[PDB]
Amino acid sequence: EFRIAQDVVARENDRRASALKEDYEALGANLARRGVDIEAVTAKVEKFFVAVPSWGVGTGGTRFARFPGTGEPRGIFDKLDDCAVIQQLTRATPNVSLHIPWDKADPKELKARGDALGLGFDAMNSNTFSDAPGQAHSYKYGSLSHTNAATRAQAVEHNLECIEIGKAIGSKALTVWIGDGSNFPGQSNFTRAFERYLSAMAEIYKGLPDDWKLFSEHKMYEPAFYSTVVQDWGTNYLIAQTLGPKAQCLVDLGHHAPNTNIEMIVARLIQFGKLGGFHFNDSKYGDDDLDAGAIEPYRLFLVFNELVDAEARGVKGFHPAHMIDQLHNVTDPIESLINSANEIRRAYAQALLVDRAALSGYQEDNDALMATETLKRAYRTDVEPILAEARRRTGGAVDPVATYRASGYRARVAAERPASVAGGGGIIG
Amino acid sequence: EFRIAQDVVARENDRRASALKEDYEALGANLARRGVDIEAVTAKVEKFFVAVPSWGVGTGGTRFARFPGTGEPRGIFDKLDDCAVIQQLTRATPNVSLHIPWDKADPKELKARGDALGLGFDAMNSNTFSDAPGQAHSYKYGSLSHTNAATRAQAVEHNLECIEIGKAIGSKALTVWIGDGSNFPGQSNFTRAFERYLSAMAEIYKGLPDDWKLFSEHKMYEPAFYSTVVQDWGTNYLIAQTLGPKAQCLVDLGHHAPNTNIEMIVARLIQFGKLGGFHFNDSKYGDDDLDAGAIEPYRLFLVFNELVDAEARGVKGFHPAHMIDQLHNVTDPIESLINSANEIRRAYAQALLVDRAALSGYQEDNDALMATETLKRAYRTDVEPILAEARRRTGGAVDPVATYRASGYRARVAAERPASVAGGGGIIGSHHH
Amino acid sequence: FRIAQDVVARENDRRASALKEDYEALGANLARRGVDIEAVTAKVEKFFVAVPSWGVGTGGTRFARFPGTGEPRGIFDKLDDCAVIQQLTRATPNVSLHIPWDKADPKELKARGDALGLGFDAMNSNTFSDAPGQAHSYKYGSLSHTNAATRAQAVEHNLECIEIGKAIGSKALTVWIGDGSNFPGQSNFTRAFERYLSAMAEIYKGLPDDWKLFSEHKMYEPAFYSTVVQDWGTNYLIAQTLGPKAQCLVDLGHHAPNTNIEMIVARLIQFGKLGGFHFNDSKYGDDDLDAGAIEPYRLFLVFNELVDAEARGVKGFHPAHMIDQLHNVTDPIESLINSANEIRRAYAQALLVDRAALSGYQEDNDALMATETLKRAYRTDVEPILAEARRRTGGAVDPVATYRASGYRARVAAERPASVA
Amino acid sequence: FRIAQDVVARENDRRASALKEDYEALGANLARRGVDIEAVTAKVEKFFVAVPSWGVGTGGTRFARFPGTGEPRGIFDKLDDCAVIQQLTRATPNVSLHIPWDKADPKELKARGDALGLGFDAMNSNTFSDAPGQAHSYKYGSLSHTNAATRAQAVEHNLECIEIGKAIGSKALTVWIGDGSNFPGQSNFTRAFERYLSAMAEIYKGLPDDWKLFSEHKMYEPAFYSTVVQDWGTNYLIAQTLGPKAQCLVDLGHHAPNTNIEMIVARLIQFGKLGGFHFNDSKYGDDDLDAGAIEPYRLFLVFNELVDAEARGVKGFHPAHMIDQLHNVTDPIESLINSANEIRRAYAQALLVDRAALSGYQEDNDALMATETLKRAYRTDVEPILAEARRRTGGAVDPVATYRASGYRARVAAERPASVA
Ligand SMILES: C[C@H](O)[C@H](O)[C@@H](O)[C@@H](O)C=O
Numbered sequence A: 001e002f003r004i005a006q007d008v009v010a011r012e013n014d015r016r017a018s019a020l021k022e023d024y025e026a027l028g029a030n031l032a033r034r035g036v037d038i039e040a041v042t043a044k045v046e047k048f049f050v051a052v053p054s055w056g057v058g059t060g061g062t063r064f065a066r067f068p069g070t071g072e073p074r075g076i077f078d079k080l081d082d083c084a085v086i087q088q089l090t091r092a093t094p095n096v097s098l099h100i101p102w103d104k105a106d107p108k109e110l111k112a113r114g115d116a117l118g119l120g121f122d123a124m125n126s127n128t129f130s131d132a133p134g135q136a137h138s139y140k141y142g143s144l145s146h147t148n149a150a151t152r153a154q155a156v157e158h159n160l161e162c163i164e165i166g167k168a169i170g171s172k173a174l175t176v177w178i179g180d181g182s183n184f185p186g187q188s189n190f191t192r193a194f195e196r197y198l199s200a201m202a203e204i205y206k207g208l209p210d211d212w213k214l215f216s217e218h219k220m221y222e223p224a225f226y227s228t229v230v231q232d233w234g235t236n237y238l239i240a241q242t243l244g245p246k247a248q249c250l251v252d253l254g255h256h257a258p259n260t261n262i263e264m265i266v267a268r269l270i271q272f273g274k275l276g277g278f279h280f281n282d283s284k285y286g287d288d289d290l291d292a293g294a295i296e297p298y299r300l301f302l303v304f305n306e307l308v309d310a311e312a313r314g315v316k317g318f319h320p321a322h323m324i325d326q327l328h329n330v331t332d333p334i335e336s337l338i339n340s341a342n343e344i345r346r347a348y349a350q351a352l353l354v355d356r357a358a359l360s361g362y363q364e365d366n367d368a369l370m371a372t373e374t375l376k377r378a379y380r381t382d383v384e385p386i387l388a389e390a391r392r393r394t395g396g397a398v399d400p401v402a403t404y405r406a407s408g409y410r411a412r413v414a415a416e417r418p419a420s421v422a423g424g425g426g427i428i429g
Numbered sequence B: 001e002f003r004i005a006q007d008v009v010a011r012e013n014d015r016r017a018s019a020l021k022e023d024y025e026a027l028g029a030n031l032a033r034r035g036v037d038i039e040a041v042t043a044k045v046e047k048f049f050v051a052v053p054s055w056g057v058g059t060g061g062t063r064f065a066r067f068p069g070t071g072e073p074r075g076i077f078d079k080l081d082d083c084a085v086i087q088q089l090t091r092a093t094p095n096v097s098l099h100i101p102w103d104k105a106d107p108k109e110l111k112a113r114g115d116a117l118g119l120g121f122d123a124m125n126s127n128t129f130s131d132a133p134g135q136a137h138s139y140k141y142g143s144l145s146h147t148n149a150a151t152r153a154q155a156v157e158h159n160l161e162c163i164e165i166g167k168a169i170g171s172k173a174l175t176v177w178i179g180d181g182s183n184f185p186g187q188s189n190f191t192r193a194f195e196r197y198l199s200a201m202a203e204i205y206k207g208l209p210d211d212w213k214l215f216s217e218h219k220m221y222e223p224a225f226y227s228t229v230v231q232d233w234g235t236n237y238l239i240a241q242t243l244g245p246k247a248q249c250l251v252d253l254g255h256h257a258p259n260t261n262i263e264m265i266v267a268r269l270i271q272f273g274k275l276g277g278f279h280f281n282d283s284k285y286g287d288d289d290l291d292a293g294a295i296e297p298y299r300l301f302l303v304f305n306e307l308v309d310a311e312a313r314g315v316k317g318f319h320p321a322h323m324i325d326q327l328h329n330v331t332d333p334i335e336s337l338i339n340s341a342n343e344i345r346r347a348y349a350q351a352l353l354v355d356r357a358a359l360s361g362y363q364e365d366n367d368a369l370m371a372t373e374t375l376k377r378a379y380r381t382d383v384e385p386i387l388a389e390a391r392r393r394t395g396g397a398v399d400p401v402a403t404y405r406a407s408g409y410r411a412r413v414a415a416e417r418p419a420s421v422a423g424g425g426g427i428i429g430s431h432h433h
Numbered sequence C, D: 001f002r003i004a005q006d007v008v009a010r011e012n013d014r015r016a017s018a019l020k021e022d023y024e025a026l027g028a029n030l031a032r033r034g035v036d037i038e039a040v041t042a043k044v045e046k047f048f049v050a051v052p053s054w055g056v057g058t059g060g061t062r063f064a065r066f067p068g069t070g071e072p073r074g075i076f077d078k079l080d081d082c083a084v085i086q087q088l089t090r091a092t093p094n095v096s097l098h099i100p101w102d103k104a105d106p107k108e109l110k111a112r113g114d115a116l117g118l119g120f121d122a123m124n125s126n127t128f129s130d131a132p133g134q135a136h137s138y139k140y141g142s143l144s145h146t147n148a149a150t151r152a153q154a155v156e157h158n159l160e161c162i163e164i165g166k167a168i169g170s171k172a173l174t175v176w177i178g179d180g181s182n183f184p185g186q187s188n189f190t191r192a193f194e195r196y197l198s199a200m201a202e203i204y205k206g207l208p209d210d211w212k213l214f215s216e217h218k219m220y221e222p223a224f225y226s227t228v229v230q231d232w233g234t235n236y237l238i239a240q241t242l243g244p245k246a247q248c249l250v251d252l253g254h255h256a257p258n259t260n261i262e263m264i265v266a267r268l269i270q271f272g273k274l275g276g277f278h279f280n281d282s283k284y285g286d287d288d289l290d291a292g293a294i295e296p297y298r299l300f301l302v303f304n305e306l307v308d309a310e311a312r313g314v315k316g317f318h319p320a321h322m323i324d325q326l327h328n329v330t331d332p333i334e335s336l337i338n339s340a341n342e343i344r345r346a347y348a349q350a351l352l353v354d355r356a357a358l359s360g361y362q363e364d365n366d367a368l369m370a371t372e373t374l375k376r377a378y379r380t381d382v383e384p385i386l387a388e389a390r391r392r393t394g395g396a397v398d399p400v401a402t403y404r405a406s407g408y409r410a411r412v413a414a415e416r417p418a419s420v421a
């Protein structure tokens, strides 16, 4: 089935085909002059996939308020349908990341719907940072590292349930992000809390299938405002190393202290074989969860420069999981996810253009200016023609958002789904 | 009316009276050796008040979740009852700051309940950062600075209504904090947005009584994650200077960029007569809204040092409004507000101990080391005995939290109020299907 | 000609074919977008940014300085090196002088300038360090020092800078001081600012009718607790207090972490106090790195505000543009060349923004298309425009490549003695 | 004695009465709290922190240096000044040396130290600056430099630092380098770290059985884009990779804004890699200000982890303590005196924490009472304990007051030639 009429896609592609041919041919000639085969780049670009977050498909909100748009998805099934659109138009998002219990539903049905939509499932995400109705033990003071044994046991059991759901739909990994921490000095004993967390994660690891990976995600702060158990990549490395070969670290771009050199963290985790994957998004102040590359596109390019360098250096067994983790508070979620996926492919494409041999020479000779200019020559290259052609060749849209709007999809689901009501956030009752 | 049994207060005071006498006399002797009359300090401390936020009386939450405790207040009336306790035990929070429409109710009933509880009302707070039921225009893309004229008018009208409610209950100021801004470069034109905001505020200003003040509150980010119209004190000054004499700037401690020297901003606003008031709280990362002084007590003291210096040298009827703006996500809201109000008095009392004459000398002398030590001599002084004695002499408790727990108040209201249910924040929408 | 014309000609010819192809390709793409590449190139070739005399020699940190070969011996060698930057990029006709570092006979400075085809931008005073024969030290401050005599000495220094500038063609004085405190209590914030305001008021009195006085804020360094002129808010208060000739200078690396610098630029423009810019890039503090080498988008967003100002018809808006960088690990001339290039690059992209479309997206609160409208301009590779602008004006298609081909560094290395002490 | 004993005696008697009143009052308050003030005083008397040889001279920034009077020149002058701090505070018996700045005949150094009653803490190598005659420059790095010969030179220097230390009684080598990049692409993050690890392994091999090797991480400066040993994570990787004798050194001012430093301390302790501390305070970057002058609670919170670690009986826990500060606007000796005082102040307050009560509030998730439990200790004015500890060990009740009364600064000013006066 096609969420977007194929005739609309065809029409909107033909409308822009001429210009694209001109832009692609021009870029091809320029790249050829630079000793690069544009065809080889396009080939790799059409193979780069990033998973879309189920929680980013509906309108997001802050602790102050939520302003839903029209046709908000009612649940996971509506979210999958909307994800199908993103994949149909960008062809870069074949897999969806589920979050439990937000996406709780019959696994068999989820798989059925996914297969029918041409969508797969990436890493499962557990939720022990919030309480569900009827929950026996509250996670107010923590979960996997809570002082109460019964509470830690409950959190561990929930994670095992996520794994069971994942095994039924085809997922091969579990991502664990918890809010565990403290808001006041002395509230928690840093070491004992970490010990409790490590012991609980060990139980999860014990129940982890041997064809699965366990990703732990660090975050400097929020919901905890004084200390956080898994606060940075250093603690994260200790966790992954301690748990086992199947445990790795997940890097969410917005979870670092101000001015942190994140691409270096990426390089370090790769060197020690603990880079499990990414949660892509952009930010300017905190964990803003904004559209990838919308704030600092060069940083995104520099992260991908480390990933490509890894391949260039000959690193093996390196297949990090790529996922988008964003919240869309003031835009049409589908459009933002479409362009964010595009931006990630944009950074990847530019990273592929780096003349590795030239860069290597300038680094060895300590020619800092030419070294940086070598990266800039790749980053300054407008690879949109490549991104658009990759989409066109694989069944997608030359201009995804334009086609999305021309299809009238949003108004369509707005009529099929109940209206929404704006409200406040979690700051007060 | 006494939320806390007088017999309990008296009992818990006598239980700690002997120790307090010893500590107070010891501190009194130490200060005397330092040329300071402890009684003069205690007298000023007893008179220092900070307003409590009604929205801080209930348990707070984040965008990820809310974990309510037992006996959660149902509405403004329950919250007023709970604030009565903070004031009874600390004697430092006689006034409550209201938020509309969260606390919207008959002004006569509000004023009536306040008088019965011995509570007054501080500045009103408007809410155009969220949508209410039946609202004609959404504030999703802004309010007072929204591109849509009808939306700006609705926001201005809401604020004018806040002034009306405030006039009826005894409030004398309106604090305006909005989320207006953008999440993406290009989404907003910085200049046009600010011009729209200034025009809208001008209309609100026209509705201010002669003895009222309009406080604009700056914030670097959140809910807007790229730009915010009223992002810092610089823009805040431009606003206040443009609007008029009744318009001043409100400084919320957790609303500044990392490493900002906040005490300097306070001094600058005082110098130009635009320091409207404060929203006290503490933080380490962003606008954490944590208990005042729980993270960086010295910073709080340094802010009060600027306030006391200005006071010491008599300045233009200088009377900034002191208010607490905190969210309590992992503690009993009443206990945190009690200790937060205590910390604010602690920093004030310590600031009063600074030898101003000596400090001035070291400053003109460029004796950096002795100047900083002059402040530290005051800051290092444990003034808890003064704070406790001030409370004891005015009908409060020597150890407020201890008395609060001994009274069993939380269990009491918990049995009177409906049970609450933990849930998520506004990060994602409902998902029942 | 610091760089032999035959070398510039040879290197341009070697790259002419590729430039032709890229420029024409870009031209057709822009035409399809409703933009006339010639109109953009005509504006770019006229965008100038002043080069800092103090950035022509190798810089250093408090830990060490690692000079390269042929370091300029003084201001005259520095002007000679600046002549290279201008000849190759054609984007830096003016130089920013710093007194007393560049103190010399005004007549001689001017003669070397005219001889090289260089002019002079804003003068820069120096009361953040002590010079020989100084009656009062600036250890504890300068224009805001508690000692009246010290403030007077600093005022006189600034007036001398104005006298030197008037003689060479300058039309402005930039004032950056380190005044502040390293400990709470050391300074009375308000009295320190009042002292500064009184001192600046005196300097303002020495300003010719057509001169400007720029005050530059900085969050910290050298002061590590408080700084008198710490941010744009205090800077605005200064400019507003002093008068029409007083404006604020924004140095990109002088703001708190995560600050929205482009908004500060917009705010100052709205109130007519944006005097000028000190361009550079950074990641941690006031790193003074090559412009756009770390965050090229931020640079573009700043220029987006500058071009919007013109779009909105702001009157008498002529900000001074200057580079303020230190080069510790590269050939200063090459970094200044590419930095000037980066600035013109961001400017050119700002010119490509479809302001009509953007205005529409802003009014309809279409956040996604509004940001995409900015990105459509920023993602455009304008290098062909920059290179064509240089070709037309006597510059080099590839400045650094032509610079290296000329062997200029090796030449001056043999002419200039390295300092031994 | 650098400071006449009769002066110390006179200034102690002058403040003896008030001290007695405050000590007895504090003694009674602590008694009511179940603590014996005598036990705390005994412990404080035994807490020592190393003073940096490079801290007794006046410091500066990249913009300027404003030396005071009696500036010590050379390690011998510096040792004489360090002796004053130890005599008056009795908290700094050991000095940290930096090579080549303090290079001198080991025998003479050891002899001067013994004569002044000073020992020697960890040695500090210097490959972040070039010494005259040096064969290879450290402009682009040292231990991680791309050039093999440069790395070997850096390694040899560190080995020489170990040789010097062994001769004077030192038992550890601290390695802090500026290695990194100022531009993206300039360095290959991974390869640079690999080179560093290989070089450090060579240094590790020259370590005596009873020696420790400390690596010090730093977010930035002198490198403004990336730094090889940028944070504690990389630092842990270095220590774990090198072996049991290698540990991480934590300098309070070397972390990203808002970093929770006390947590890093806890994590390093848990994994047995907390080698030591470089104490100082800051507000913006690596400001190197007097310990506790900006954020005293943070300092107390770091000590809370240290004291908890002992209370827990953690193995491999025996960190070194050193002050690493720069004094640009105060008398270096007075600042080091009060900084050592602040460090003992934080230690004393941490000792007052009711560990039993705290543990209970943590287990029951009583966050409010848990933090108030820490505050009860931190709010306690322990000055009487610090003062009595000094009085009892040959020091001064009020160190700075005695120092000033002694006229020491004027004394050395009359013995040492300033650049100009
Ligand atoms: C939804 C998801 O669990 C969540 O966003 C985490 O990955 C982390 O980014 C939270 O800040």
Ligand SMILES: C[C@H](O)[C@H](O)[C@@H](O)[C@@H](O)C=O
Pocket (backbone or CB within 6 Å): B055, B099, B125, B177, B217, B219, B252, B279, B287, B325
């Ligand atoms: C509830 C109140 O309006 C709010 O807290 C504001 O004062 C401001 O702090 C928001 O960040």
Ligand SMILES: C[C@H](O)[C@H](O)[C@@H](O)[C@@H](O)C=O
Pocket (backbone or CB within 6 Å): C054, C098, C124, C176, C216, C218, C251, C278, C286, C324
């Ligand atoms: C050299 C020049 O005065 C200086 O760079 C100032 O402009 C300012 O950037 C200092 O941080």
Ligand SMILES: C[C@H](O)[C@H](O)[C@@H](O)[C@@H](O)C=O
Pocket (backbone or CB within 6 Å): D054, D098, D124, D176, D216, D218, D251, D278, D286, D324
């Ligand atoms: C002088 C000493 O080696 C130096 O201060 C290092 O320890 C580190 O702090 C540098 O930033």
Ligand SMILES: [Mn+2]
Pocket (backbone or CB within 6 Å): A177, A217, A252, A279, A325
């Ligand atoms: Mn995430």
Ligand SMILES: [Mn+2]
Pocket (backbone or CB within 6 Å): A252, A254, A255, A287
């Ligand atoms: Mn997140």
Ligand SMILES: [Mn+2]
Pocket (backbone or CB within 6 Å): B177, B217, B252, B279, B325
């Ligand atoms: Mn507030």
Ligand SMILES: [Mn+2]
Pocket (backbone or CB within 6 Å): B219, B252, B254, B255, B287
């Ligand atoms: Mn707030």
Ligand SMILES: [Mn+2]
Pocket (backbone or CB within 6 Å): C176, C216, C251, C278, C324
């Ligand atoms: Mn500058």
Ligand SMILES: [Mn+2]
Pocket (backbone or CB within 6 Å): C251, C253, C254, C286
């Ligand atoms: Mn600067």
Ligand SMILES: [Mn+2]
Pocket (backbone or CB within 6 Å): D176, D216, D251, D278, D324
């Ligand atoms: Mn150090």
Ligand SMILES: [Mn+2]
Pocket (backbone or CB within 6 Å): D251, D253, D254, D286
């Ligand atoms: Mn340092």
